[PDB]
UniProtKB/TrEMBL annotation, chain A:
Coiled coil start-end: 93-124
Start and end residues of each stretch annotated as Fusion peptide: 1-13
Glycosylated residues, chain numbering: 71, 78, 85, 97
Its membrane topology: Single-pass type I membrane protein
SS bonds (residue pairs): 58-64
Domain of life: Viruses
Membrane-spanning ranges: 1-16
Protein name, as recorded: Transmembrane protein gp41
Cellular compartments annotated: Virion membrane; Host cell membrane; Host endosome membrane
Annotated stretches, region: Immunosuppression: 34-52
Residues of the Retroviral envelope protein GP41-like domain: 11-124
Length: 124, 136, 446, 112, 122, 455, 125, 446
């Protein structure tokens, strides 16, 4: 419990508590300009991640499912040993250089889904 | 060298205005710190400061003889004239003149002329003095 | 049998990054450090312990000490900016030795200098006098001049502000976190098996010293020695004390402070005639507890340099007074103590108080800057302060004596080592809430 | 006005013998700037008075080294190390703190 | 159109219809003052938006969740509640507000796990 | 129960909080810097009926922020001006007698002093006319200088702080500024005609920005202020406490004509390289004392209205008396204000010189002009006001007074009221009496018969 | 993303509507420090102004989202095939900027009426 | 049977607006503060835009004004930490220079002597320095004073920084783009058929020139003429070249820099003595290249005034030296060249280098700023500087009677005209992601 307290827990156990980490993303002298620049950087980083999530099919969703098939060559692991045996940090260190190719395909998949929904809703 | 000379009537009748002319040599009263005093001395008695004039026309007189003394000067001929009205026979004595200065110094950083104190700082030179006799 | 990549928000994933830390202090007139404009700290800071995680902490590379050094320099310059500059003090001083109740050790240390100073009026000057220490005056050809006269002019420190090291806390901004290593036997570099996150670090006193860590943090269980390279003679090998020893530094001279109107609205606080006898400033350290602490230091050094190897603590190897003398601040005045009496022993295998002469300087260069100096005003009254030393900044000497007679001498002119002895448990990480993981779920088409 | 008192009235001394002339004032002659204003004057028989000491201790230019002065507040003494045969005359004191300036009664110096 | 904040004195039924005019209105010494005020206003908006976006009302200014309304919170009949005012109603629910927020967060976090498990059956 | 919780974003709710209200102007005058954003040409004043908000003064943060902002603006305005550090010299002054009068005898000094030129090695001797309130004798000893003697003087700020001089290209005119609230905050304007200093306002109306607030500076009489609606008002934190200032607001204004009949001349000398000191030149014509004219009948009627309103807070049979200031420095004991760049210090003893029993002509107020003004009760930050050429005239509206109740009486006898005015925040409290900043909370919960549909 | 940022500016609206992710992704990306901070804050406020205006409608998290408002024939007065096949997004704005404010105002009242209809609908299940 | 409005987020729609651009440098101290600037991208790729034309308009965009204010602010901030030359405003006793003074330099250099203060403010010193005739004015052997004594005192230029123009790049922030034109036949204003989008502009040299454009870009096809109104003689004519010519500006005077201690730490770098020969500084440009370049200007300039017209090149119309002479800076020395030998020819309808006498000024006041200003320290040794003439700033005469004899004289109104010749293709713009378009889509309701 508490911010990041679920960092050492498994992937399945840490997925249950995510609001505790999501709420902490906002929270003459040089202190004023320093804290102002830090506040701007923090809100800008939160906005960048929120818009990166919003361009996909997850708008304000923590547990969001996606219809994109998972490539087996990305991890070569099953579902049991990655959700009940490993943590989030160990999972991040395995696909550190495979994140951009997943993020790029997610945007095109959502772009195709949006046009497929728009064209289907226009025919009646 | 700086020298001072005084002049005036030696024999002055009673109740007559006495004038004394002081000639300044080697210096001028127009300097930023010069001032000329006036001290009289009775025969066989102590000295008595009468009046003085500063560079900025500041006239100073004695408390007992304020209503009788009158000092003035001009920068044309560089002379100081002291006027004394209602002369008494007890006023007979030698009348001297003196020179004093504020000792203004020039700064090295800025070129402003400063000073340490705003007083006489001793009477440097003295005049020869004239003998004024008040009798009929 | 099918897997689909899903996006999870708010995952507990962090990465190392660099950012500007906040300011935090208690709500307890002025100060040279973080003033009243600083953000107040919370009375109950949250500390969440994290298990199953071994973070790779590494000091001497973290940006916390560099950021602290930069903002401390900025605070010092900002505090000295509105104070009165001592530029018209560059005048010839006709100094002379002081003999009123002089002693055998304070002979020639103080100089009774007289000079012509400008008053409030531009066309008037005054003949004032002041007592200047021998360490801040130099001869010209009786005529003396300030040591800083041929260099940048010093700014007289305002008496309203104080040099008291009020503890400050460096809070991390949103999206970042501070990880504290809870391991008691954790050295400078290595994976900490017990790392606990925290919103804001504890009170870090911004005290600056050169050879002894004054008012620092004590070790949890035993003296720890940290160095980048334990085999290198350089890199400023520093230690940490598990127990503190008391040091009593004082200025027995009952000094007085006189105000001199240097200019219109500016006052130069000089030194007047001291009351009573004169005496040299000193620091008292008990021989028993210091010898016991030194005995713990050699025991903790023998595990790194091998057993049955005799080691020797000796005094500095030369340089200027800032590195050769133990400099610090006590009550407002700056001291420079001869620490040769402490590091003077030879520890051989299988084995009431120490006074240290000190010198007080008024014109100093606190940091390693030549263009920025500050004249500390003399505070009246008897100065006395009691503090704790919790560490030393030692330096080895090169040699080929087959790992025998290892001489350890203090040094460490850099201030960032002093600052790092408190920020070693903390590090800054950047939280990455975006994460991708595969699961057997497909988004329905609507 | 500040009344000035000079003791003694006459100082008969032998040549080569030290002598001192005391002086007092009604109020302190210390200026606000820290300077004590007091001067000594010597009037030779048949000659005009001349300045000897200024500001209690500062000696005048061209005056002999034997002349010296000291004191502060309301007490001032004019110490003469050696009395010569030419030093005979009338010695006068003067305050320069404020106008009008008042002189002392004088101290006649005559050889014994 | 009563105007910005013009429906404060009206009832809940009339104030709940024109609340979008208040929702869209939430977005040298003068330079630093303006920058600090703008930064504070921006961070003050996003915080509320996230507290909302955390629940199932990310882009819904009028939404009704499935959390049970504890009577203890108000103990007040429903007909007379809609037609006091929001100003007269906020001072009473103030003590129960944080409890309500926590309940909402928990329910949404579960609902998401339930939909994730529901999509795994096919 | 069939009731569930529903969330509404946009709910109208208020909360007291402190924010940095920014300004707005109708649009060199660096006193306001002219960089502030212009106000909207059509200020929307939305009326908020069926709601009452508790308004309370003397604790509002808008007046404190305005005080700090005007102080920072004054410091920023005086920042690039020329410092008067070399002016601290021994001034050889003397009294002026060129067509002098009896009331102005000794109030103006003809000073002479050495001044620096554009070159450091050369110096110049300039002449300036300083007031008696700006010079202090250096060496007050060595007295009995001839009646016409050059005594040595110095400026008052020489032993305190060498301050700057007000630049002539800027103006100290009270340009109205509107304090607006940022996003997520609102300004509530209480439009009650009979609004009292502390209490629930019946008719409240929100607004995006306040009206034109002229930052006038005064100590005893509120000049160019906002008048009342129909009846004069009197406000105080504790009417039974004599240590609190009794604010008074008028409903009709009294015309006050302040003037300076001296035909002043301004001369500019090069105090240094690129810096110039505007000194006071020779006076053209006769010299007369500056004064202010107040109508006798209008002031008496206004005083009677104030007395009538003072009979309800206290006993109406009590004798209300008006006395002058108790004493102290000229910054508080006299009515200090600015009139066309010249600072006036008027003696208001004639205004408060009447008693009231529960049963055209004009008065002249003698004023004195000072050039060294700290302006904010400071001890080390003053300013020098340069002289203004020609005569100076002013027409103002005294809309209020800052009275101080003199306690200590008993049995409801001789209740006297003296003018006061301590901190400058009391001058702006009578202008911001209708505004109060509030923080809006668009988030709110309520019960409704709903449930999240399971999809 | 092969076309790049603003690469479909001169292309038709039919082909440029499938590459709106790059434009939306590029919306975030001492006196100099204060002006840089002002520029960053201005970009943030410009993004929130469009995001909240799109969020008050029924298009909170959709790039291509439709609304329940009948298109007025007087706004365009032409066919539909010629709009999505030869006209560009740049020249279309010049034809709709004269009354875009009225279209935006409509998109607000329609979402308000649809939301109150949904609120009244969710009352018995 | 109708359509429905459908909103699109991310449409490529632009709107002209003003935005404060941010710097970008290669990060290779500098007068333009390269350290206080965001580093540039290693490869700012361009995005070519097809089937679109943008209406470009010069002399009205806010980029040139923003760059002008940025250059002024950077120049003032980089000059702020330098020492002030306030004690230099004293009387100078100057005499003419000896050691075989030439005829062209006869009376152009003076040997001034003055009293200055040492590190101690209570001591003076008699120092001498060499000041040009343009930096001193007589006081009515004679007494002289600096030309900046009645105006403001000028700070000396810190020798630690250099005046070399480092190429800076301006980039648009988030939500804005800077479109650039690419056609060879680019007019002054109007539509551009080849518009491209790039994140950061190319390297703009912040050079300061008043008569001839130095070290700028070159045209890819031919010489182009740009002006707001070519029929109006009040507007300056901007000319750019396709092939630049080389100028060889040298300073044969081998001078020695002498440091004068004017105060504590601060030093005044004065011209000690001319150890070498004394000669006038000059610039050498080939007559053949200049004649060919002028022959290309008339060919591409007669299209705006007719083929049968006769144009004449005259020298400057008269006025101040800093606005009538070609002013630039090479290695720290500011030159002022007389271009009367270049613009002196007549064109009809159909040993080898030109020397230009240049003056050297130390106390220069760049831009149109009067109060603020700067003193240029003397650079020791022979100054050698070569550069490319990439453009001219012309100005026509009034009257224009009998449609012939059009006299062209060099201009030099404001520094903006220099940066206008470099930022001719770039134009800032604001993008709008909101888009409204109708279709047959209908949102499904519950
Ligand atoms: C103390 O720090 C040292 C480094 O100064 C650590 O030494 C490591 O020792 C292992 C032994 O196998 C080496 O492989 C590593 O390379 C060393 N680390 C480094 C960074 O050089 C040592 O582990 C640390 N001790 C503790 C208890 O953490
Ligand atoms: C002053 O003390 C120093 C240091 O002991 C000594 O060298 C010097 O001679 C002394 N000077 C006098 C005048 O006593
Ligand atoms: C109002 O509330 C009371 C108390 O719960 C309840 O008894 C009553 O029936 C309610 N009235 C209506 C009209 O619903
Ligand atoms: C010095 O040169 C000037 C012209 O610059 C001339 O007037 C003057 O006579 C010359 N003086 C001497 C001594 O050659």
């Amino acid at each position: 419990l508490g911010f990041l307290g679920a960092a050492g827990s498994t992937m399945g156990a840490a997925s249950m508590t995510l609001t505790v980490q999501a709420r902490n993303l906002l929270s003459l002298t040089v202190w004023g300009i320093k804290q102002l620049q830090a506040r701007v950087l923090a809100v800008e980083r939160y906005l960048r991640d929120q818009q990166l999530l919003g361009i996909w099919g997850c708008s304000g969703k923590l547990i969001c499912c996606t219809n994109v098939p998972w490539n087996s060559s990305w991890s070569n692991r099953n579902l049991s040993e990655i959700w009940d045996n490993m943590t989030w940090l160990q999972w991040d260190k395995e696909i550190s250089n495979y994140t951009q190719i997943i993020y790029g395909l997610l945007e095109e998949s959502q772009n195709q889904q949006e046009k497929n929904e728009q064209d289907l809703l226009a025919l009646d | 060298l700086v020298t001072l000379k005084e002049s005036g009537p030696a024999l002055v009748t009673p109740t007559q205005t006495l004038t004394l002319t002081c000639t300044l040599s080697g210096f001028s009263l127009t300097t930023t710190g010069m001032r000329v005093n006036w001290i009289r001395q009775a025969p066989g008695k102590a000295l008595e400061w009468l009046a003085r004039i500063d560079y900025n026309e500041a006239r100073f007189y004695s408390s007992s003889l304020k209503t009788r003394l009158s000092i003035s000067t001009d920068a044309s001929k560089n002379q100081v004239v002291l006027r004394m009205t209602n002369m008494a026979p007890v006023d007979t004595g030698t009348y001297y003149c003196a020179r004093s200065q504020q000792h203004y110094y020039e700064d090295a950083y800025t070129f402003d002329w400063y000073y340490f104190h705003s007083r006489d700082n001793g009477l440097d030179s003295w005049g020869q003095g004239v003998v004024v006799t008040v009798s009929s | 049998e099918n897997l689909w990549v899903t996006v999870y928000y708010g995952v507990p994933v962090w990465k190392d990054a660099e950012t500007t830390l906040f300011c935090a202090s208690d709500a307890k007139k002025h100060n040279v450090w973080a003033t009243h404009a600083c953000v107040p700290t919370d009375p109950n800071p949250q500390e969440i312990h994290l298990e199953n995680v071994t973070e790779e902490f590494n000091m001497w590379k973290n940006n916390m000490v560099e950021q602290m050094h930069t903002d401390i320099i900025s605070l010092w310059d900002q505090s000295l900016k509105p104070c009165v500059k001592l530029t018209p003090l560059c005048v010839t001083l006709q100094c002379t030795n002081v003999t009123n109740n002089i002693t055998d050790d304070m002979r020639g240390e103080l100089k009774n200098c007289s000079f012509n100073m400008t008053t409030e009026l531009r066309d008037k000057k005054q003949k004032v006098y002041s007592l200047f220490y021998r360490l801040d005056v130099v001869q010209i050809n009786k005529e003396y001049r300030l040591i800083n006269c041929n260099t940048s002019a010093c700014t007289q420190a305002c008496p309203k502000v104080s040099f008291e090291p009020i503890p400050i806390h460096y809070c991390a901004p949103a999206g970042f976190a501070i990880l504290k290593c809870k391991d008691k036997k954790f050295n400078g570099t290595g994976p900490c098996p017990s790392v606990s996150t925290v919103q804001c670090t504890h009170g870090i006193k911004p005290v600056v010293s050169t050879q002894l860590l004054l008012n620092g943090s004590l070790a949890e269980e035993e003296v720890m020695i940290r160095s980048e390279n334990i085999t290198n003679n350089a890199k400023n090998i520093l230690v940490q004390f598990n127990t503190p020893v008391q040091i009593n530094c004082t200025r027995p001279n009952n000094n007085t402070r006189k105000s001199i109107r240097i200019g219109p609205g500016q006052a130069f606080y000089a030194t007047g005639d001291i009351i009573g006898d004169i005496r040299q400033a000193h620091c008292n350290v008990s021989k028993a507890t210091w010898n016991e602490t030194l005995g713990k230091v050699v025991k903790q050094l023998r595990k790194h340099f091998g057993n049955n190897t005799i080691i020797r603590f000796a005094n500095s190897s030369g340089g200027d007074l800032e590195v050769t003398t133990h400099s610090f601040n006590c009550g407002g005045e700056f001291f420079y103590c001869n620490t040769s009496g402490l590091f003077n022993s030879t520890w051989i295998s299988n084995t009431d108080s120490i006074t240290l002469p000190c010198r007080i300087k008024q014109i100093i260069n606190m940091w390693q800057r030549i263009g920025q100096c500050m004249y500390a005003p003399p505070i009246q009254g008897v100065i006395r302060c009691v503090s704790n030393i919790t560490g030393l900044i030692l330096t080895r000497d090169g040699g080929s004596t087959n790992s025998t007679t290892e001489t350890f001498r203090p040094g460490g002119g850099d201030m960032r080592d002093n600052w790092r002895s408190e920020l070693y448990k903390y590090k800054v990480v950047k939280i990455e809430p975006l994460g991708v993981a595969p699961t057997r779920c497909k988004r329905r088409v609507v | 006005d500040i009344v000035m008192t000079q003791t003694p009235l006459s100082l008969p001394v032998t040549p080569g013998e030290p002598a001192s002339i005391s002086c007092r004032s009604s109020q302190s002659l210390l200026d606000s700037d820290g300077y004590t204003h007091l001067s000594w004057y010597l009037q030779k028989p048949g000659q005009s008075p001349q300045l000897l000491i200024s500001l209690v201790s500062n000696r005048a230019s061209g005056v002999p080294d034997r002349f010296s002065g000291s004191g502060s507040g309301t007490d001032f003494t004019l110490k003469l190390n050696r009395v010569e045969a030419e030093d005979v005359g009338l010695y006068y004191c003067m305050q320069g703190l404020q106008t009008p300036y008042t002189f002392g009664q004088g101290t006649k110096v005559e050889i014994k």
